[PDB]
Amino acid sequence: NKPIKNIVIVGGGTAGWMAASYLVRALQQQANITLIESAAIPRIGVGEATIPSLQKVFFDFLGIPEREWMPQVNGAFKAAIKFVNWRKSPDPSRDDHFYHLFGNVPNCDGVPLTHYWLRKREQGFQQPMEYACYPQPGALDGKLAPCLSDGTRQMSHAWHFDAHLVADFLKRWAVERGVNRVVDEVVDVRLNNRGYISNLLTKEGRTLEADLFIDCSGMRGLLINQALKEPFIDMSDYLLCDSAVASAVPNDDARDGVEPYTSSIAMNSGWTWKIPMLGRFGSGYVFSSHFTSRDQATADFLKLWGLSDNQPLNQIKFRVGRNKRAWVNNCVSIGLSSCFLEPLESTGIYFIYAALYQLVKHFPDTSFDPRLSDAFNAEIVHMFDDCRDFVQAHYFTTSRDDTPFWLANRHDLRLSDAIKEKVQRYKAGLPLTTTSFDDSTYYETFDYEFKNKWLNGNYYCIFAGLGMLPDRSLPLLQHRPESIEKAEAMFASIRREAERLRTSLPTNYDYLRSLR
Amino acid sequence: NKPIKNIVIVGGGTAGWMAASYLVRALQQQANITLIESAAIPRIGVGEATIPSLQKVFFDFLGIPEREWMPQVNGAFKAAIKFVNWRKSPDPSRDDHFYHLFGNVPNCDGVPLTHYWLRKREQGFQQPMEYACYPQPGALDGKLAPCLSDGTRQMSHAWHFDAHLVADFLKRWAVERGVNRVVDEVVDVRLNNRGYISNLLTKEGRTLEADLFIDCSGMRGLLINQALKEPFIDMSDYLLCDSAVASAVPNDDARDGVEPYTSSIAMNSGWTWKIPMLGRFGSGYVFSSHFTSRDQATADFLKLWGLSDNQPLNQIKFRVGRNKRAWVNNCVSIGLSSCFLEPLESTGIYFIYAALYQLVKHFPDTSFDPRLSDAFNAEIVHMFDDCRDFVQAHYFTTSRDDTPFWLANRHDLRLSDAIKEKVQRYKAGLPLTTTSFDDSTYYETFDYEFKNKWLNGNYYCIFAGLGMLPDRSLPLLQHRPESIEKAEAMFASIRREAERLRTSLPTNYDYLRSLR
Ligand SMILES: Cc1cc2nc3c(=O)[nH]c(=O)nc-3n(C[C@H](O)[C@H](O)[C@H](O)COP(=O)(O)OP(=O)(O)OC[C@H]3O[C@@H](n4cnc5c(N)ncnc54)[C@H](O)[C@@H]3O)c2cc1C
Ligand SMILES: Cc1cc2nc3c(=O)[nH]c(=O)nc-3n(C[C@H](O)[C@H](O)[C@H](O)COP(=O)(O)OP(=O)(O)OC[C@H]3O[C@@H](n4cnc5c(N)ncnc54)[C@H](O)[C@@H]3O)c2cc1C
Ligand SMILES: [Cl-]
Ligand SMILES: [Cl-]
């Protein structure tokens, strides 16, 4: 079969230029890549939070080190997500916060530290799980950097940045390496009688043709949804939020510092993200239109940060779910054109480079073997649905009942058999999927991580944080006092590391300043 | 809940004493373990072949190094399985053999060497896959040891031994560490109205009681099948063989050497195993009674090795399949009481210590939370069904059509959706599950291996060996000539290692002799 030689990418957002960059890197020879993007249709970039695999899977593949791209996007460091007022109904006299931290939890004789902690709590141990099982939460409370002053890594971390800038960065990178950039707007898509994309008709009268089309046109799904009629699976029965009111809020970093984490502040009919950068933090009230009006949500958002009625706002709406098939005929959907999930766990950009990773792993020729796209589509389904369930697990697990929104999350959600099964195992006291701690190649081979994205530690951070604990500790531990004693030594070690971090880490602000 | 304190194991075979050994090791405190075995009911031990996880998962857990247990069981080294006359109808003028080797296949720019080999074959490359992608097949042809004379490991390996002796070894090991051994025969099992095992009535009038019962009574399933009425899922529609005629055959190792591998010699209505040890090799014609009589199979077996009509034979029969649930109420089935699969891929003893591993991971208290057994049962189902599909893939893939037996395997088998999906992906040219080569922690964390037992390399050895190749090479490779060039360097390196092994390895016989 003849190889794919001409590729057309529709879209100049984060998805489009990640696709252009990744493909021009992966396809070293025999690859003509063209990207068309409309100047009259804006890109989505609200100030985004990410996860560590952005470096390992995407930028490492491009050969771009962290020190190269991060200052070009005015990046800040992210070491966790802090959930505020998610556990109980808001009480100004109560400190309601917990962290979902990056990194793996140590194992002790084949059992994660989370389970040794639970047994301790049964006997009266008061300290919260993540403060016992991780070394960095207290450091995050102190708004400290994830690295020493000399740049030595001290904890797993990701990044906060304006996605507009990473698109510009990748634009310059990809164009320099041969990607043809076209500023124009597609107005019509022509299919043959078979149903394959023949050509694209633009606004300036250009006719674009290719062997392979990549749809990065955003939520509208110009190619995959509108032209190819691939149905979008609405999953509003799984998750309730469908809107957002967002803006940027100035921050006096000199006296307030820069929080080295994303915040998720539970509201009456949703939650508000806080994504710190230098000089400001991006913020957005994600809400359900069925429980609050955009007007009311706007008022709550302004009141939360004490913003004025003159503050410019980014009014957003979206549909939760995914296409039935991400790849149909000769068109691959990447980004918002493929799927969407509320930014509760920073999975948006992850969906992009994870899908691109899978596209190269299933790269077609001009014959377009349906076995390739079928396999690709199955991977996308697994990827999205797994993250959807993890996010949903934040909702039906909550104890809040103060508003109709939270009551609905507790009782009226549709749950997959998969997430029901995990929760059942968790409640039984069983550890979920764990990996080796004294190895960490889980982060080095993406096939492993892609198929097992969320581990025991991730779920425990969420569940224990929301106050939903297993019925009992592992029955096995009653037979292994030596293992229990060994776990105590590990807890003590974590406590010592936390104390060392407190006096060794520079503030996140000072470290970000040293990088200018 | 009160902890499990009294445990009764029924059975003194390989399963029973592995269970006794593993549990007395895992349950350091609060564990009274009793094993009852009948002296009038023999154990099954035909001379068994194993896989490397026996050391990593079982003996390492007991703290017993290879050098300790192997000479106690008169063990020989196994480095692969050689399949003879499986590809085509037997032709004495043709050499029909291929190896299924232990170990992982190297990756080159995210693609296994198997796929770079396939592309080469498309362009005329003649050398068989496993001889190109592995360094040791030629060494195995030369009957060389898997280690240097000084004991330095040179290739991944497992073991051949009489399972009777490993049972005796573990018996002595477990009894010395507190396991109570009872020589008697259970004649009646009493259940309460709930359906839980109350007590065991023996032949000498003893009444045995416990919190937890382990059924290692063999194929009869004294507790799980007969008492608890748990249905056995007959899978004769998946696999056709149901019988075996076996014996031991003397070998002049001084002039013939000792083959460092198990052989699988395809017959008219089944296949014959060859499991070499010092001084002899165990052998057994596995056959389907629906295509040949035991009498005819016996004659073929004797004729194959030139044995006489006076040669004592072990006439065996079995049912292929598994219990619907491995663990019911307060009874856990381990070994032949749980499931059986023909020894095509040496999975029998694997099923034992893998299940025991899972039992400890799901260890109950006296309340017996059904969530624990449900989770355990699901793992057993995955374990068996996955190995069943892998074994079955040897059968429906063959090109042989010379007998009704092989025609039936080609056309009349029932295939799971899972195996159909894998074959489809393979035929499309896609790599199956792969792991990191420059790491090998896949063999260090059993959770990983248990869920992903058979990798791309394993399937490729079987499929390419049977002459069933993908329709085409990976389309991506047409865009990456640099990766192709890089793979050539790896092939050259493997060729050099093979040449070094040829002149460096002692013969398997001489090395086994040096260990006496
Ligand atoms: C409210 C919100 C919060 C988010 N938070 C996070 C987060 O915290 N972390 C994270 O990682 N991700 C997050 N995401 C996701 C992420 O921001 C976006 O998915 C990503 O940055 C851009 O996706 P996209 O490029 O596919 O869509 P878009 O940004 O909409 O890109 C659309 C592009 O296609 C072009 N185009 C469209 N139509 C046509 C046409 N007819 N002809 C020609 N050209 C055309 C447009 O000009 C534009 O260039 C969030 C998304 C939203 C909506
Ligand atoms: C033909 C064949 C080939 C095989 N090849 C391989 C191979 O190559 N590699 C591999 O790893 N595995 C292989 N296996 C599997 C392996 O040999 C056996 O599964 C294992 O060695 C023994 O299994 P078991 O102990 O559960 O059953 P058994 O050996 O039958 O043990 C039964 C025990 O339960 C006791 N018992 C029974 N009944 C009663 C009662 N009413 N009261 C009291 N006590 C009782 C018996 O006395 C006996 O001790 C093979 C099996 C077969 C049949
Ligand atoms: Cl997101
Ligand atoms: Cl076996």
Pseudo-torsion of CA A416, B390, B16, B362, nearest 10°?
-20
Q: B87: number of CA atoms within 13 Å, CB side?
A: 20
A146-162: string of b/e by CB count within 10 Å (b at 16+)? Answer: bbeeeeeebbbbbbbbb
CA distance B66 to A333: 53
Pseudo-torsion of CA B101, B103, B107, B112, nearest 10°?
30
Q: DSSP class of residue B144?
A: B
Other Cβ atoms within 10 Å of A476 Cβ, number: 23
Place of tokens 């691109």: A356
For chain B, the first-to-last Cα distance in angstroms comes to: 52
Instruction: Report how far Cα A11 is from the mean position of its chain's Cα atoms.
Output: 21
Of B362, B252, B246, nearest in space to B314 by CA: B246
Q: B163-176 and B14-26 are packed helices; what angle lies between their axes, rounded to 10 degrees?
A: 30
Q: Please give the interface size between A and B, counted as residue pairs whose CB atoms are below 8 Å apart.
A: 119
B219 and B318 Cβ atoms separated by less than 8 Å: yes
For residue A108, give every residue at least 6 positions away whose Cβ sits within 8 Å of its Cβ, in sequence order, or none: A116, A483, A486, A487, A490
Widest CA span in chain B: 77
CA distance A474 to A230: 47
Chain B neighbors of A375, CB-CB under 8 A: 425, 428, 430
Place of tokens 């549909």: A319
- Phi and psi (nearest 5°) for B68? -85, -50
For testing contact with chain B, the best of A371, A427, A438 (most B CBs within 10 A): A371
Place of tokens 């047994």: A119
Write out the E strands in A321-471: 321-323, 327-328, 331-333, 339-340
A162 and A74 Cβ atoms separated by less than 8 Å: yes
Share in percent of chain A as helix, strand, coil (round to 5): 40, 20, 40
Kind and range of the H or E element at A188? Answer: strand A186-191
B422 and B111 Cβ atoms separated by less than 8 Å: no
A334-348: string of b/e by CB count within 10 Å (b at 16+)? Answer: bbbbbbbbbbbbbbb
B361 interfaces chain A, CB cutoff of 8 Å: yes
CA distance A515 to A507: 13
CA distance B462 to B316: 27
B8-40: string of b/e by CB count within 10 Å (b at 16+)? Answer: bbbbbbbbbbbbbbbbbbbbeeebebbbbbbee
- β-pairing verdict for B243-250 and B280-287: antiparallel
- β-pairing verdict for B80-84 and A212-215: unpaired
Place of tokens 């190895």: A439
Q: A96: number of CA atoms within 13 Å, CB side?
A: 20
Of B496, B501, B382, B457, nearest in space to B114 by CA: B457
CA dist A458 → A194, A390, A462, A511, B82 (Å): 45, 9, 7, 28, 44
CA distance B6 to B278: 41
B343 lines ligand 2 (CB under 6 A): yes
A308 and A279 Cβ atoms separated by less than 8 Å: no
3-state secondary structure (DSSP) of residue B418: helix
Give the number of the ligand closest to the Cα of residue A318: 1
B471-505: string of b/e by CB count within 10 Å (b at 16+)? Answer: ebbbbbbbbbeebbeebeebbeebeebbeebeeeb
B416 and B395 Cβ atoms separated by less than 8 Å: no
Q: B370-395 and A417-427 are packed helices; what angle lies between their axes, rounded to 10 degrees?
A: 130
CA distance A64 to A174: 12
Q: DSSP class of residue B19?
A: H
- β-pairing verdict for B270-277 and B48-49: unpaired
Of A62, A43, A505, A447, nearest in space to A260 by CA: A505
CA distance A37 to A184: 6
Q: B348-361 and B14-26 are packed helices; what angle lies between their axes, rounded to 10 degrees?
A: 30
CA distance B269 to A179: 60
For residue A123, give every residue at least 6 positions away whose Cβ sits within 8 Å of its Cβ, in sequence order, or none: none
CA distance A75 to A306: 25
CA dist A201 → A36, A43, A180, A298, B439 (Å): 11, 21, 17, 39, 50
CA distance B317 to B241: 9
A395 and A413 Cβ atoms separated by less than 8 Å: yes
CA distance A346 to A264: 11
For testing contact with chain B, the best of A441, A480, A483, A484 (most B CBs within 10 A): A441
Q: Fill in the amino acid letter for B198.
A: S
Other Cβ atoms within 10 Å of B264 Cβ, number: 24
Chain B neighbors of A211, CB-CB under 8 A: none
B321 and B340 Cβ atoms separated by less than 8 Å: yes
Of A228, A224, A332, nearest in space to A8 by CA: A332
CA–centroid distance, residue B389 to ligand 4 (Å): 14
Contacts 24+ apart (CB under 8 A), A410-419: A413/A237, A413/A238, A413/A239, A413/A240, A414/A237, A414/A238, A415/A238, A416/A238, A416/A385, A416/A389, A418/A385, A418/A386, A418/A389, A419/A389, A419/A392, A419/A393
Q: Which structure tokens are listed for A510?
A: 């000072």
- Extents of the domains making up chain B: 1-516
CA distance A291 to B91: 77
Q: DSSP per residue over B357-400, as a string?
A: HHHHHT--BTT--HHHHHHHHHHHHHHHHHHHHHHHHHHTT---
Of A455, A395, A459, A345, nearest in space to A82 by CA: A345
Of how many residues is chain B composed? 516
3-state secondary structure (DSSP) of residue B106: coil
For testing contact with chain A, the best of B29, B60, B371, B443 (most A CBs within 10 A): B371
A35 and A43 Cβ atoms separated by less than 8 Å: no
CB-count burial class (<10 Å; 0-12, 13-18, 19+) for B258: buried
Q: Which structure tokens are listed for B513?
A: 């002799």
Of B249, B234, B243, B264, nearest in space to B316 by CA: B243
- The residues of B assigned a catalytic role are 78
CA distance B428 to A371: 6
3-state secondary structure (DSSP) of residue A411: helix
For residue A483, give every residue at least 6 positions away whose Cβ sits within 8 Å of its Cβ, in sequence order, or none: A108, A109, A111, A116, A477
For residue A26, give every residue at least 6 positions away whose Cβ sits within 8 Å of its Cβ, in sequence order, or none: A61, A360, A363, B476, B479, B480
Q: What is the CATH number of domain A1-516?
A: 3.50.50.60
Contacts 24+ apart (CB under 8 A), B197-205: B197/B223, B197/B227, B197/B228, B197/B329, B197/B330, B197/B331, B200/B8, B200/B10, B200/B36, B202/B36, B203/B38
In this complex, do A475 and B448 lie within 8 Å of one another by their Cβ atoms?
A: no
Pseudo-torsion of CA A120, A122, A124, A130, nearest 10°?
50
Other Cβ atoms within 10 Å of B185 Cβ, number: 17
Residue minimizing CA distance to atom 43 of ligand 2: B185
- β-pairing verdict for B80-84 and B262-266: parallel
Chain B neighbors of A427, CB-CB under 8 A: 371
Q: Which structure tokens are listed for A133?
A: 């099982």
- Phi and psi (nearest 5°) for A394? -70, -30
CA distance B9 to A512: 63
CA distance A428 to B362: 10
CA distance B328 to B369: 11
Q: In what order do the strands lie in the sheet with A270-277?
A: A97-101, A80-84, A262-266, A270-277, A280-287, A243-250, A314-317
Q: Which structure tokens are listed for A214?
A: 């990549």
A114 and A105 Cβ atoms separated by less than 8 Å: yes
Of how many residues is chain A composed? 516
3-state secondary structure (DSSP) of residue B197: strand
Q: DSSP per residue over A117-167, as a string?
A: HHHHHHTT--S-HHHHH-SSHHHHHTTB-SB-TT--B-S--EEEE-HHHHH
For residue A488, give every residue at least 6 positions away whose Cβ sits within 8 Å of its Cβ, in sequence order, or none: none
Q: Fill in the amino acid letter for B229.
A: K
Q: A348-361 and A370-395 are packed helices; what angle lies between their axes, rounded to 10 degrees?
A: 160
For residue B483, give every residue at least 6 positions away whose Cβ sits within 8 Å of its Cβ, in sequence order, or none: B108, B109, B111, B116, B477
CA–centroid distance, residue A10 to ligand 1 (Å): 12
CA distance A19 to A357: 10
- Quickly count helices (H) and strands (E) in chain A: 18, 22
A299 and A183 Cβ atoms separated by less than 8 Å: no
Place of tokens 């399985």: B81
A46 lines ligand 1 (CB under 6 A): yes
Of A361, A335, A406, A120, nearest in space to B428 by CA: A361
Of B121, B139, B74, nearest in space to B460 by CA: B121
Pseudo-torsion of CA B451, B455, B456, B461, nearest 10°?
-140
Give the number of the ligand closest to the Cα of residue B341: 4
A228 and A195 Cβ atoms separated by less than 8 Å: yes
CA–centroid distance, residue A217 to ligand 1 (Å): 8
A490 and A108 Cβ atoms separated by less than 8 Å: yes
For residue B412, give every residue at least 6 positions away whose Cβ sits within 8 Å of its Cβ, in sequence order, or none: none
Way the structure was solved: X-ray
A357-381: string of b/e by CB count within 10 Å (b at 16+)? Answer: bbbbbbbbbeebbebbbbbbbbbbb
Place of tokens 């499931």: B339
Of A51, A79, A103, nearest in space to A261 by CA: A79
Helices (H), B396-432: 404-411, 417-427
CB-count burial class (<10 Å; 0-12, 13-18, 19+) for A252: exposed
Catalytic status, residue A78: yes
CA distance A407 to A397: 11
Q: DSSP class of residue A54?
A: I
CB-count burial class (<10 Å; 0-12, 13-18, 19+) for B188: exposed
CB-count burial class (<10 Å; 0-12, 13-18, 19+) for A356: buried
Q: Fill in the amino acid letter for A509.
A: Y
Residue minimizing CA distance to atom 20 of ligand 1: A14
Q: Fill in the amino acid letter for B269.
A: S
Nearest C-alpha in A relative to B429: A372
Other Cβ atoms within 10 Å of B140 Cβ, number: 21
B164 interfaces chain A, CB cutoff of 8 Å: no
- Phi and psi (nearest 5°) for A459? -65, -35
Helices (H), B276-324: 294-305
In this complex, do B371 and A428 lie within 8 Å of one another by their Cβ atoms?
A: yes
Q: Cα-atom radius of gyration of chain A, to the nearest Å? A: 23
Helices (H), B27-128: 53, 60-62, 66-69, 113-122
Of B450, B379, B386, nearest in space to B421 by CA: B386
Q: Fill in the amino acid letter for A312.
A: P
Q: Which structure tokens are listed for A412?
A: 């009226």
Write out the E strands in B88-196: 97-101, 158-161, 180-183, 186-191
